[PDB]
Structure formats: C-alpha cells, structure tokens
Amino acid sequence: MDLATLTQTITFFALAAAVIIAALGVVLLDNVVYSAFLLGGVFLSIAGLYILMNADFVSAAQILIYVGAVNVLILFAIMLVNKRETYTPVPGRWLRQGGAAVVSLGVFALLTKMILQTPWQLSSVPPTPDSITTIGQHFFSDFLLPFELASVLLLMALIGAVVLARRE
Amino acid sequence: GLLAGYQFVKDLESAGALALFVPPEGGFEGRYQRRLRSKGYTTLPMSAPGLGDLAAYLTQEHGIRPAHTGKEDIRVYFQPPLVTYHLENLPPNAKGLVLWLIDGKRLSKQEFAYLAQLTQTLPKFKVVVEVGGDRVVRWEPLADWVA
Amino acid sequence: PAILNPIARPEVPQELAENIILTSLNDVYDWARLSSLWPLMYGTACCFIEFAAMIGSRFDFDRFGLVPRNSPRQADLIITSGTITMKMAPALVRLYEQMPSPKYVIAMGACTITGGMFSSDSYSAVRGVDKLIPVDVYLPGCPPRPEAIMDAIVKLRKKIANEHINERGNLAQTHRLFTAKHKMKPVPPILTGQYLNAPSRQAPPP
Amino acid sequence: IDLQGQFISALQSLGLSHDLAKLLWLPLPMLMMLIVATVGVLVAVWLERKISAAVQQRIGPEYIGPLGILAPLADGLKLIFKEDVLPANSDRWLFTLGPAVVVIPVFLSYIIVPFGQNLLISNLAMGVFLWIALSSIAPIGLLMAGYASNNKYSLLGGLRAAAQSISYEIPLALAVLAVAMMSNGLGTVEIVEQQSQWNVWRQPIGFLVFWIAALAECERLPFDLPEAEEELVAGYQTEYAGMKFALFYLGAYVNLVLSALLVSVLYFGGWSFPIPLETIANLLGVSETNPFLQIAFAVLGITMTLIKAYFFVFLAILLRWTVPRVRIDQLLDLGWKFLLPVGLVNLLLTAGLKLAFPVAF
Amino acid sequence: VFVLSGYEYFLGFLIICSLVPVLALAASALLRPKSGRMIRLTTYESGMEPIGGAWIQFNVRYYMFALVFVIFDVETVFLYPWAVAFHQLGLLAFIEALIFIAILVVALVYAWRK
Amino acid sequence: MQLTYVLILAALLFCIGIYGLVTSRNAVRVLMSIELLLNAVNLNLIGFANYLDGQQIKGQVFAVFVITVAAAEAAVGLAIILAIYRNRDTVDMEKFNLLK
Amino acid sequence: MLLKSTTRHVHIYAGHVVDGEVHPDTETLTLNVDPDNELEWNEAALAKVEAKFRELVANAAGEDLTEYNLRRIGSDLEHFIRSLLMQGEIGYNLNSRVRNYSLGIPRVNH
Ligand SMILES: CCCCCCCCCCCCCCCCCC(=O)OC[C@H](CO[C@@H]1O[C@H](CO[C@H]2O[C@H](CO)[C@H](O)[C@H](O)[C@H]2O)[C@H](O)[C@H](O)[C@H]1O)OC(=O)CCCCCCCCCCCCCCCCC
Ligand SMILES: CCCCCCCCCCCCCCCCCC(=O)OC[C@H](CO[C@@H]1O[C@H](CO[C@H]2O[C@H](CO)[C@H](O)[C@H](O)[C@H]2O)[C@H](O)[C@H](O)[C@H]1O)OC(=O)CCCCCCCCCCCCCCCCC
Ligand SMILES: CCCCCCCCCCCCCCCC(=O)OC[C@H](CO[C@@H]1O[C@H](CS(=O)(=O)O)[C@@H](O)[C@H](O)[C@H]1O)OC(=O)CCCCCCCCCCCCCCC
Ligand SMILES: CCCCCCCCCCCCCCCC(=O)OC[C@H](CO[C@@H]1O[C@H](CS(=O)(=O)O)[C@@H](O)[C@H](O)[C@H]1O)OC(=O)CCCCCCCCCCCCCCC
Ligand SMILES: CCCCCCCCCCCCCCCCCC(=O)O[C@@H](COC(=O)CCCCCCCCCCCCCCC)COP(=O)(O)OC[C@H](O)CO
Ligand code: SF4
C-alpha cells in the first residue's frame, strides 16, 4: 500500500529467487567452477537480504569475508585440485540420493510447519539505524568472552592450517 | 566545415581533373575518395612517382622489366595500359573511373598538363592528384594551378 | 591465353550507400579507427631497431595515436620489421591470423617486400611477405629512416580513411576447405625440454 | 538552493503523486556521477599519455584533436568496432563476465564520493567500509578471467593478479580504520566534516600506508604485475580483443580517479579552501538561505576537491615512470611484512593518542 | 519496516552501473565484424603451437597467501566497530582490543616465521 | 516481507545445503554446502534480530561471530582437503572409505 | 600439436575442421585454398585444385609427417595455383581489398 513497501517486497522476492536459483546451482551443476562462482552469487544475494533487514554492517562484513575471502579461497583450492574428473558411477547411488532427497523434503516440511505454527512476538517498534555502534558496544560489554576467544580461535586455525597445508 | 556534402563529386564531374591540397597527416582525404566511390565512380590509386612517360603507362603499352638478380636473364612483360584495361573491367553500373595519384608533388608541370588534357578525351576518366599543401582539404581544377 | 594473370571482371556492381547521414557516420567510423592504430610489438631483425627509434623521443609515433601492444589480440597493425626466414614464416602467419579482423599490414625494409639483399643465393629467407599475408603499404630501403616509417603510416591512414562501413563484406575469410586421408608415419617431436637433464650431458660415453 | 527540493516541488505542482517524484529524481544524480566518472576516465587516459610524454622529453597525441583531446575518444571507439575473439576451448560465459565483474563494483563505489556536501549520491552510513567491502570483488573477476581460458599463460597471470589484489586489502583497511577512529564514524561526509579549521597532519603514517596500498591494487608501474609487458605478455588480458578488453582498459583508470578522490576526502577534504571557509561571516553573508553564496561555495568546494584529486592522479602517473618494478615476491613483502605491521602500528598509535588526548581526535 | 537511510540510491545505482557493461558490450556486439572462426580461435603461445599437456605444476604458493588473508580479513571486521565506537567505550576496552591485536600479531609472526 | 517468509527461506536454504552436503561427490562441494547451511543460520539470526529484538540487536553480533567462524572452518577444511589430496591424489568422496 | 604449411592462398593442416576448430588428427590433411580471397574462383578450378591435392597427398606419400613434407606439398599446390592463374582459368579478385598482385601482374602473352 505504498511505493517504499512495494520496492521492499519486490526486492525481497527478487533476492529470494536469486538465492534459490544460485543455491540450487551450487549443488546441482556438474561443473565445479560454476558452483564456485554461483556461491559468490549466493553470498552477494544474502548480503543484499541483510541490508533489506536493517543490518547494514553485517552485510558489508559478509561481502568482505564470504564473497571476498572465503570465495577466493574456494576458487584457489578448486583450481589446485583439477585432474579432469574421471568419476566412475557407483551402484549404491540412487539409494543415498533418494534418501537425501526425501529427508531434505521432510525436514523442510517440518520446519515450515513449525515456522507457520508458532506465534512469534513481533514487538512492533522501529529498529535502530545506528546498528554498528551497538555492535561495538556489545563486543566489550556483553560479548567480551567470545570477542576475546575469537582471537585465539583464529590463531589456532592459522597454526593448524599452515601445518596441514605445508610442503615438506 | 567539419562535415562535407557532395560538392567534391560535382566539381570533379565538372572540371575532370582536380588537384587536392590535403594536410600532411593523410587521414582527411580518404573520405572524399569514399564520397567519389559511393556515387558510382571507381578509384585506383597508384602513387605517381613510379610511372613512366604517363602516356606509355596510361594510354599505350609498356614493357616492364622485372628484377633479375644474376639469374633469369632480361625478360619483358608488356603489361596492358593501366587505364584502357581498367575501363574495360568496370562494374556493370559504373559511372566512370577516376585516377588517384598520391604523391603528385614529384611530377612536373608538363605531366600535369598532360593529365589534365587526357581527361577531355577518353570519356569515362577523371583524375585526382594529391599535390601536397594546405592545412585543410581544399581542391582546385588541375587545368588551373599550372601556368 | 589472351591476357596472362587476368582480372575478375565482376558483376553485381557496388550496392553502395549515398545518404548524408550514413556517410557522415562512416566518417567517424573511419576517423576513430585510423587515428588510434595500435601496432604489435613485433620485430625480427635490423629494421626493428629503427622502429624502436620511431618509438623514442627523437620522434615518437605516440602522436597520431600509436601505442605499441604486446599481444596480437589488441593489435590492429603489424609492421613487419626484419627478414622472415622459412623457420619463422608460420610463426608470423599465426600472429597475423590470431588478431582481430579490421587489421592492417606494413612491410618495411627491403627484406619484407621482395626478399631484399637476400633475394639471391639464400635458401631460408622468405622472398617477400606479400606471399604470406596481404600487405597494405610497402616502404623500401635497408633500414628506412624512421621518418619513412611515419610516411608509410601517413599513406596507411589515408587508405584506412577510404573504407566503407557498407563494404565490410570483403573482410571475412571464405574457407574453401577440403580433406584427404594420408599414410605418412607420424614421428615423435624432436623438440622438448631435457637439455641439462639429458643422460648424454652428465658423462662421456665409454 | 537544494535542486532536489525545487525538482520535486515543481514536479508535484502538476500532480504526479509526490512520493513518485522522489523516485523520478534518482536517475539525475545516478547519471551525474556516471558522467563525472567517464570524464574522469578520459582525463586520466589523456593525463597519462601526455605526462609520460613530458617526463620523457616528448610530445603525446597531437594529431587527433587540438592537443590530443580526442585521443581517448578514438581509443575507445576503436575498441568498440573491433571484432571480438573467443578462443577454441575457453569458457563462453566466464570469459565475457570477468571484465564486467572487475568493473561493476569499481563504478558502484562512486556512491560515497562527496564533491562537496549535499553534492553526493546518498551519503551512506557504511561509507568507506562499503568501499572496502566492494573492492574485494575484483579478485573474483581476475580469477574468472584466468579460469575461463585455454591459455596457461593467462591463468598464471590471473592467479598472480588475484594474489596481489588480496595482499593490499588488509593495510588498505587498517589505514581507513585509523581514519575512522578520528572521524567518529564511517560516512564520507561525517569523515570530512571533522576538518573544520586535515587528517594528513595527524595520520602521517596512515596516509603513506593508504596511498601505497591503493597504488598497489594492480594499478601502477611501481607494481602493475599483470600488466608488466616484458616479464609476461599482458598476463590475463592477453586474450581479450574488443570492448571486453576496453573494460579492463577502463576499469583500471576509474579505479585510479576513485582512489585519488578517496585519498583527497580521507586525508585532505573535498571542502575547505584551506582557511576555515564558513567563517566568512566577515562578508555578512547569510549562507543559510543565501541564494548565491551557496553557488559560490559550491564551486569553491568542487574546485578544491578536484585540485587534490588531480594532485594524486598526477603523482601516481608520475611514479609510474619513476619507480622500478618489483618481481612478485618483493611485492608480496610490502603487504604482510611492511605494510601490515606499519598499519597495525598506526592503528595502535591513533588509539593511544585518542585515549590520552581526546581533543583533536 | 526499513529505517536504513541512504538506501534507494545503492539499488538504483547498482542497476544503472550493472547496465553500463551490458550496454557497451551489446552496442559493440551490434556493430563489429562477424565471426573470424577458423584459426583466429587458437591460444596465443608466442606464435608457436601449444606444447601439449598444458598443466600448471600446482603450488601451495597461493593457498597460504589466501589463508593468511582470510585470517586478517576477519580481524578487520572485528576491529571496525571497536574503532567506530571508541568514544563511548573509553578505557578497559582499549585493553581488550589490545589483547586481541596482540594475539593477531603473534599469529602474523607465526605466519612470517615459516 | 514478513518474518515467516525469511524463516521459510532460511529453512529452504538449509534444505538445499543438506542435499548438497549428502549427495555431492566432489570434496570441495560439501564444504560449499556447509557454507550454504551457515548462511541459512545467519539469515534466521538476522530475521529474528530485525523483527523481535530490534533495539539491542543481538542476533547481528551472533551473526558476525558465525561469519568469522565459518571463514575459519573453511580455512581449516580446505587445508584438510589439500592434505588428503596430496596423498590420495583425488577428491572423489566415494574413495575415502578405508573400511567394510 | 598441429603441423601445418600455411602460406598465402594455401593452408594445409594436420587435422579435421569439425566446426571451426582444427583438432590435430595425424591423418586428415585439410586444405584451405585462398582464405583471404586474393583470387576469384570457379567450380571447375576448385575441383582441379582438389584433384591435384589428392593426387599429391595420396599418389606420392610414404614418408614422414614432418612439417618439411607438409611444406613440400603446399609448395606444389601453390605452383599449380599459379599455373592456373597464368593460363587464365582464374583471375585476381579486383575487389576493394588490398589488391597487391602477389602472383604476378597481368601481362599480354607476347
Ligand atoms: C568531464 C569532467 C567535467 C565535465 C563537466 C560536468 C558536466 C556538467 C556540465 C554542466 C556545467 C554547468 C554548471 C555550472 C556550474 C554551477 C552550478 C553549481 O555550482 O551549483 C552548486 C549547487 C550548490 O548546491 C547547494 O549548495 C549549498 C551551499 O553550498 C555548500 O557546498 C559545500 C557543502 O558545504 C560547501 O562546503 C559550501 O560551504 C556549502 O555552503 C547547500 O549545500 C545546498 O544544500 C546545496 O543544494 O549544487 C548544484 O546544483 C550543482 C549540480 C550540478 C553539478 C555540475 C557542476 C559542474 C562543475 C562546474 C564548476 C565551474 C567552476 C567555475 C566555472 C567558471 C570558470 C572559472
Ligand atoms: C520519461 C523517461 C525518463 C527517462 C530518464 C532518463 C533521462 C535522463 C534525464 C536527463 C539527463 C541529465 C543527466 C545529468 C543531469 C544533472 C542532474 C543533477 O544536476 O543532479 C544534481 C546532483 C544531485 O545532488 C544534489 O544534492 C543536494 C541535495 O541534497 C540531497 O542530494 C543527494 C540526493 O539526496 C544526497 O543524498 C544528499 O545527501 C541529499 O541530501 C543538492 O543541493 C541538490 O539538491 C542535489 O540535486 O548533484 C550530485 O549528485 C553531485 C554529483 C555531481 C557533482 C558534480 C561534481 C562535478 C564533477 C566536476 C565536473 C568536472 C569533472 C571533470 C574532471 C573529473 C576528474 C576527476
Ligand atoms: C555514459 C555516457 C557516455 C557516452 C559516450 C559518448 C560517445 C560520443 C561519440 C561521438 C564522438 C565523435 C567525435 C568526433 C570528433 C571528430 O570528428 O574529430 C575532429 C577531426 C579533426 O580534423 C578536423 O578537420 C578539419 C580539416 S579537414 O577539412 O577535415 O581536413 C579541420 O577542422 C581540422 O583538421 C580538424 O578540425 O575531424 C575530422 O578529421 C574529420 C572527421 C569528421 C567527423 C564527422 C563529424 C561528426 C558528425 C557526428 C555524426 C552526426 C550525424 C548527423 C550529421 C549530419
Ligand atoms: C542520428 C543517428 C541515426 C542512426 C545512428 C546509428 C549509430 C550506430 C549505428 C550506425 C548505423 C549503421 C548501424 C548498423 C549496425 C551494423 O554494424 O551493421 C553492419 C554493417 C556492416 O556492413 C555490413 O557488413 C556485414 C558483414 S559484417 O558483419 O559487418 O562483417 C554485411 O552483412 C553487410 O552486408 C554489410 O553492409 O555496419 C553498419 O551498418 C555500421 C557499423 C559501423 C557504424 C559505426 C558508426 C559509428 C557511429 C558511432 C559514432 C557516433 C558518435 C555518437 C552518436 C550518438
Ligand atoms: C555488492 C553487489 C550488491 C550487493 C547487494 C545488492 C542488493 C541491493 C541492495 C538492496 C537495497 C534495499 C532496498 C531498498 C529500499 C527501497 C525503499 C526505500 O529505501 O525507502 C526509501 C524511499 O524509497 C524509495 O522511494 C525508492 C523506491 C524507488 C527505487 C527503485 C529503483 C530505482 C530504479 C532506477 C530509477 C528508474 C526510474 C524510472 C522508472 C519509470 C526511504 O527514504 P529515505 O532514505 O529518505 O529515508 C527517509 C524517507 O525519505 C522518509 O522518511
Ligand atoms: S630490411 Fe634491411 S635493415 Fe631490415 S633486417 Fe632486412 S636487411 Fe636488415
């Protein structure tokens, strides 16, 4: 019933369609590099969806990390492991494929019933626009243990990854 | 005036032999040749410094002697007239055949007068001679510019 | 046998255009194209150095827009500078065919228009590049003064300004291609790596 | 004046659904910034070709226009009409997309280029951080141009390009971090309005780090590794012919005017004819609604932005012909071994000086 | 609800900027020579023919340089809201951020020592 | 644009990521599916933060942490894959079965 | 890798052009007479050239597939093309292209 809300609905559904198609391409396509780039497509669409949800900092952070760091890492590694893909078909395949399909559809139906059934508490008060200063306040007041332990997490990840991918 | 109509073709059909004065960078007279070619006239440029009498090369025959280099003792070729042979090989609906001369500065006043006179006879035959010069692409009838 | 090496004598005369708008747009199509020629950085022998002198400060072809390019994909002009031996002829045709269609050729020096000083008693030099690729301009002379290469550039610009956008049909390749099976014993290539790791380099034979 | 106010009001005077007028105005700045970006690209090409010629006792293009002014126009129009090639076994869709992914986010970062206050497209809250995030998509474009080629020559160039563009993203972020410490925020207008009487004089190390990192974005002959002709032929560009190559030729100069404007706004300021101009109450001007003074100060601000953007464009295309190239390993040691430590040190120093002397920070 | 002010321009400008390549590259496609198919379609190998095989001799040279980049890319994300909000925090947040930065410095030293 | 739509979208992305995590045969594609799953989680967190807890946004900080650690786990997983490839010389996930 | 003898108006390869590619084969010996259209061709002249190519590749070949022998075949094909042009079976194109008479100028057979 407005021009702003109409744009916010059309953009949401466009980004949702982009997410679904790119995420199906990531997992269904036979070529792996097409999947590696459609993954960056997924990440960009989700970064847009964040901006559409009043979260401007975390969207830019996602664009930094996912489609700027993790995607580049995945592209490098996909190049490192090219050997012309001589995958011979295995008999016990339709079994696991059908099982994955049915369990996925069932879990999705279950989650959709749970989401459409539960009465969420909408709390109709407009959110805050300055969403980065609040995240800055929560890093050192409330979430101080995780903010401090993420450093050691990154350090141990660096150590272990250099050890595993080293050459000797 | 930064864009030209078709006055060049009218002036060529009137005079018969023009004398261009292109600027010494050579990218601003090709459009006038394209104007000529779009009307129906066919061009053929042959770099005047390198033709013979201009009467044995254009009207009559002439025995070209290629470069024997110790082998292949002197032989002549007798290539056909560079004009009478190209007037026969015109496209079906061809308005004529104009002759383009790039380095007209090397020729002499006698040869210029000859090329001017050759336009009246030999009907379907016009002449353009890029005598070097002015900083704009200006032309002038080749009967003039001499004497 | 009336006239040896005859001419075409064609039909369907020109189908050229005349309206002022399309020829005025052709003016720009030909002005943008001739005043921004990008030569391929391709030298083989002596003449290349004069070409390099034509790049230097003493007189640069940077004016009238010439920027030397390394790959043939961006180059639209190949100034063949140097003698083309039979060992390297296919290495030039390639570089010429591997290069976009509105392209041009200048044969500089005597060794690329007639064979030059090697047109006699030489068993490896290609006697002129006009028998490999369609040359546009010839400038004669063992190494031509680099203000003769620029004269060739002038004579090539005034040829480019002649083209007609309604005439780009004479720019594709017809490809009249055939096929014939053979029986000719393919041999192994004798040109690989293995120069210092070859077993014959490490110890003399007994 | 507030041209937006007048436009929307005069458009609502004849009806047209006032809320819809605000939608009918977005194309106006969204294409004014495109116009200034394209003119900046033409200026950058012309300046490079005419300054490299002066440095070398030479003359640049002079037979195209009056002074070679039409040289970039000719070089672009040629690449438009050029036949495009797509080699034998190369991919068909990542080929024609690399040169576009390396260009779209370079244009999109012009949202935050101020050119004076109220003279920019939508001063954003993320501002410079959004640019740091958007400048991380070009490596995807280079990996895409390298992966979609049957030429192992150019895959090795795409890899060494995507590995240089990520080496100079951490220091380029640690310099903007120290700038945002003082700036109290991230929006470019809020970053620059702290200059009310310049950050270069208080961040003399962050300026150096930012400038070096921006010049090392696969841009200048100090590095320009994937364009270093001698060591390797054009790197990944060696297979693009027509407009697809002009997209590289263009996305590398817009990525230079952008960096010049950004150094201007971060460390110098697209405002402020050096004296504290807005304290010109000495001419008793009621700026507030002065119909002119507004246009006079607008012109002054635009000129003062362009002076300091041209300063850095000039200095970059001057260093191009002054600094010798580094192989690739002397390059990857600038980042991660000299620029990253000095970036961290500058950040800690700005933090210590902001905690101790909260005035002037 | 949507309270992010400045957005309206990022969407429209994203559209108008994505339209620049897909319009220039289409104008070039309309007016340019057709095909050049036969041998124009080979790979540039300095004029010679591709040697055959055509591999790369894979190297970890460019996985490690992306691992270490991901680490500090996350570091900058963690450090941005600390810097933007350094006013309301004051002291005792400088200490925690300093511990964070010291841990990341030891990480960099470890990566630089191998 | 309601909370239920965002949650259903996140659940469907979770579904697709699970399918790719179980079905795919290449070894990097399972890691990409794990990334899809973590994105499906972050979308839940941001939707809840935008609608329910909109003032002291706490799903967004949790999402920042999730993004951090997804990057870290990817950095470790590609290392594990490079290690297994350097020895088995393949990434066919149907050949890493040293059992009966 | 390809093995080819490429000159003006003769292009012999060692593969099969499936749609525009080349695909080295080791027995196809494709041929591409006059790609740049220096000359104007007829149906009888192209058939004569194909017949010469066949009798040159088939009747005289038991030797190696070195590029030397490919050049040796291309040279004979081009001498045959020049002889055809001398006798007058074909002629130069005369179109608005480069027009450099690479095989000789027109003479009058005296
Ligand atoms: C290829 C590169 C070059 C290509 C050129 C670009 C193509 C466009 C060609 C058209 C040029 C004709 C326009 C005439 C310029 C005068 C218009 C002007 O100044 O208008 C200015 C107004 C001002 O806007 C108002 O400005 C007010 C006050 O100025 C403020 O501006 C800044 C913000 O604080 C300053 O800090 C200043 O102190 C502050 O007071 C308020 O900010 C209002 O909010 C704001 O709406 O904006 C506006 O409409 C301006 C919007 C149009 C932008 C076009 C500007 C072009 C630059 C021309 C500069 C000329 C220099 C001198 C020319 C003669 C040679 C000596
Ligand atoms: C029916 C079919 C319809 C189809 C539609 C398609 C048809 C297209 C219509 C015609 C095309 C016209 C294109 C340009 C027209 C100019 C419009 C304009 O003037 O638009 C004005 C715009 C808008 O910003 C202005 O903004 C202020 C108003 O504030 C608001 O303006 C913005 C929008 O809100 C910001 O959000 C700002 O924060 C917000 O508060 C001003 O006072 C004006 O009101 C407002 O218009 O100007 C700006 O955006 C600033 C950007 C310009 C700055 C200029 C600096 C110029 C650069 C120097 C030039 C030389 C460069 C060469 C060298 C380069 C080397 C580096
Ligand atoms: C995001 C949006 C961005 C979109 C991108 C924008 C794309 C813009 C594309 C257009 C750019 C075209 C620039 C042309 C500049 C130029 O021509 O160079 C100027 C040169 C300089 O020589 C001149 O020539 C004269 C000498 S002479 O007589 O020619 O010899 C003399 O004037 C002197 O030499 C010199 O002045 O002029 C010429 O040499 C002759 C070329 C003729 C040009 C044609 C005129 C233009 C007509 C346009 C078509 C209109 C159709 C309707 C007309 C009836
Ligand atoms: C007031 C403006 C009014 C119109 C403006 C239009 C401008 C752009 C289009 C120009 C008009 C002709 C376009 C047709 C498309 C096409 O290429 O057809 C194919 C034919 C090729 O001819 C053809 O060649 C074809 C083969 S081939 O593929 O080209 O090799 C062949 O099939 C065909 O028979 C042969 O004729 O080419 C043309 O028709 C024109 C192509 C080049 C024209 C360039 C003009 C340059 C203008 C830009 C500068 C202006 C500055 C800014 C102005 C805004
Ligand atoms: C890095 C690659 C991309 C990653 C991310 C991509 C995803 C895109 C980002 C998603 C953007 C989010 C949704 C945009 C919100 C639209 C509605 C809106 O923003 O509300 C504003 C208003 O919304 C609009 O009016 C915009 C609707 C029009 C936008 C449509 C796109 C324009 C298309 C080009 C123009 C075409 C015009 C001609 C059409 C005939 C609010 O106004 P304000 O900022 O002034 O705040 C105060 C307000 O004025 C009153 O309180
Ligand atoms: S053309 Fe003359 S100068 Fe050039 S390489 Fe041949 S012999 Fe030497």
- Chain F nearest-CA distance from A37, in A, is 11
D186 touches chain E (CB under 8 A): yes
The CA–CA distances, whole Å, from A48 to B136, D285, E4 equal 58, 45, 13
Closest CA to E80 of D229, B18, C42, D177: D177
Contact C170, G40 (CB under 8 A): no
Tokens matching residue C180: 């014939």
Distance between alpha carbon D340 and the CA centroid of its chain, in Å? 21
Q: What angle do CA B99, B101, B105 make, to 5 degrees?
A: 145
For residue B137, which atom of ligand 3 is closest to its CA?
30
- Label the pairing between strands G10-12 and G5-7: antiparallel
Contact B133, B2 (CB under 8 A): no
Q: Which chains touch C (3 or more CB pairs under 8 A)?
A: B, D, E, G
Tokens matching residue D215: 């010049």
List of residues 6+ apart from G69 with CB closer than 8 A:
C184, G61, G63
C142 known ligand binder: yes
- Chain A nearest-CA distance from D124, in A, is 10
Q: What is the dihedral of CA C163, C169, C173, C179, to 10 degrees?
A: -160
Q: What residue of A is the nearest CA neighbor of D139?
A: A72
C111 known ligand binder: yes
Residues D170 and D154: their CA atoms lie apart, in Å, by 26
DSSP A86: -
Contact B34, C162 (CB under 8 A): yes
Strand order in the sheet with B17-18: B17-18, B126-129, B97-101, B42-45
Tokens matching residue B39: 């009307």
**Which residue's alpha carbon is at the smallest distance from atom 47 of ligand 3?**
C24
The CA–CA distances, whole Å, from D176 to C130, D195, E62, E70 equal 60, 16, 26, 18
Q: What residue of D is the nearest CA neighbor of A32?
A: D147
Tokens matching residue G45: 């002249």
Q: Taking CB atoms and an 8 Å cutoff, what residues of chain G touch B89?
A: 94
Q: How far is the CA of A155 from the centre of ligand 3 (A)?
A: 62
Q: How far is the CA of D19 from the centre of ligand 6 (A)?
A: 74
Q: How far is the CA of E67 from the centre of ligand 6 (A)?
A: 54
Q: Where are the domains of chain C?
A: 1-206
Q: How far is the CA of D7 from the centre of ligand 5 (A)?
A: 18
Q: Is F75 within 8 Å of A112 when comparing Cβ atoms?
A: no
List of residues 6+ apart from C57 with CB closer than 8 A:
D56, D57, D58
Structural domains of chain E, with CATH: 7-113 (1.20.58.1610)
**Which amino acid is present at A50?**
Y
List of residues 6+ apart from C203 with CB closer than 8 A:
none
Q: What residue of A is the nearest CA neighbor of D128?
A: A60
The neighbouring-strand residues paired with G6 are G11
For residue F49, give the CATH number of its domain: 1.10.287.3510
Residues B17 and B95: their CA atoms lie apart, in Å, by 16
Q: What residue of D is the nearest CA neighbor of A31?
A: D91
Domain count for chain F: 1
Q: How far is the CA of D298 from the centre of ligand 1 (A)?
A: 5
Select the residue of C36, C74, C76 nearest D74 (Cβ to Cβ). Answer: C36
Whether chain B lies against chain E with 3 or more Cβ pairs closer than 8 A is: no
Cβ-Cβ pairs closer than 8 A, E with G, add up to 16
Q: What is the residue whose two structure tokens read 């009307």?
A: B39
Residues B61 and A52: their CA atoms lie apart, in Å, by 85
Q: Where are the domains of chain B?
A: 1-147
Residues D140 and D100: their CA atoms lie apart, in Å, by 11
For residue D122, which atom of ligand 5 is closest to its CA?
44
Helices D294-319, D254-263: crossing angle, 10 deg rounding: 120
- Chain D nearest-CA distance from C150, in A, is 13
Q: Taking CB atoms and an 8 Å cutoff, what residues of chain G touch E52?
A: 1
Letter string b/e over residues E65-96, b meaning 16 or more CB atoms within 10 A of that residue's CB: bbbbbbbbbbbbbbbbbbbbbbeebeeebbeb
Q: Is A129 within 8 Å of E5 when comparing Cβ atoms?
A: yes
Q: Which residues constitute the domain of residue D158?
A: 1-361
Select the residue of A26, A58, A108 nearest F36 (Cβ to Cβ). Answer: A26
Contact E47, C72 (CB under 8 A): no
- Chain C nearest-CA distance from D28, in A, is 29
Ligand 1 pocket, Cβ-based, cut-off 6 angstroms = D 1-3, 35-36, 39, 116-119, 271, 278, 287, 294-295, 297-299, 301-302
The dihedral sign for the CA sequence A88, A92, A94, A97: negative
Residues C32 and D246: their CA atoms lie apart, in Å, by 15
Interface residue of C9, C11, C27, C167 to substitute, partner B, most B CBs within 10 Å: C27
Phi, psi of B22 (to 5 degrees): -55, 155
- Chain E nearest-CA distance from F49, in A, is 13
Burial class (CB in 10 A: 0-12, 13-18, 19+), F3: middle
For residue C166, which atom of ligand 4 is closest to its CA?
36
Domain count for chain D: 1
- Label the pairing between strands G39-40 and G91-92: antiparallel
Burial class (CB in 10 A: 0-12, 13-18, 19+), C159: buried
Other residues' Cβ atoms within 10 Å of the Cβ of residue A12: 19
Tokens matching residue D116: 């004076």
Distance in Å from the first CA to the final CA of chain G: 48
DSSP of chain B, one letter per residue? --S--SHHHHHHHHHSEE-----TT-SSSHHHHHHHHHHT-EEEE--STT--SSSTTTTS-B-------SSS------BPPTTHHHHHT--TT---EEEEES-GGGS-HHHHHHHHHHHHSSSS-EEEE-----SS----BTTSS--
Phi, psi of A97 (to 5 degrees): -65, -50
DSSP of A126-150, one letter per residue? ---S-HHHHHHHHHHTTSHHHHHHH
The dihedral sign for the CA sequence E29, E30, E32, E36: positive
The dihedral sign for the CA sequence B112, B115, B118, B124: negative
Q: Is E38 within 8 Å of G32 when comparing Cβ atoms?
A: yes
Ligand 2 pocket, Cβ-based, cut-off 6 angstroms = D 1-4, 27-29, 31-33, 36, 39-40, 43, 115, 118-123, 257, 302, 309
The neighbouring-strand residues paired with C146 are none
Q: Is A73 within 8 Å of F1 when comparing Cβ atoms?
A: no
Q: What residue of F is the nearest CA neighbor of A90?
A: F94
Q: Is C157 within 8 Å of B25 when comparing Cβ atoms?
A: yes
List of residues 6+ apart from A27 with CB closer than 8 A:
A35, F16, F17, F19, F20, F23, F24, F29, F32, F33, F36
The dihedral sign for the CA sequence F29, F30, F33, F38: negative
Tell me which H or E stretch contains C79: strand C77-81
DSSP helix/strand/coil, G69 = helix
Tokens matching residue D167: 């080496």
Contact F27, F86 (CB under 8 A): no
Residues G53 and G77: their CA atoms lie apart, in Å, by 7
**Which residue's alpha carbon is at the smallest distance from atom 31 of ligand 5?**
E12
Residues E12 and E10: their CA atoms lie apart, in Å, by 6
Q: Is F75 within 8 Å of E71 when comparing Cβ atoms?
A: yes
Burial class (CB in 10 A: 0-12, 13-18, 19+), D196: exposed
Distance between alpha carbon G30 and the CA centroid of its chain, in Å? 10
In angstroms, this model's resolution equals 3.2
D236 touches chain E (CB under 8 A): no
Q: How far is the CA of E31 from the centre of ligand 4 (A)?
A: 5
CATH number for the domain formed by residue range(s) A3-165: 1.20.120.1200
Instruction: Give the number of residues written for chain C.
Output: 206
Contact A57, A135 (CB under 8 A): yes
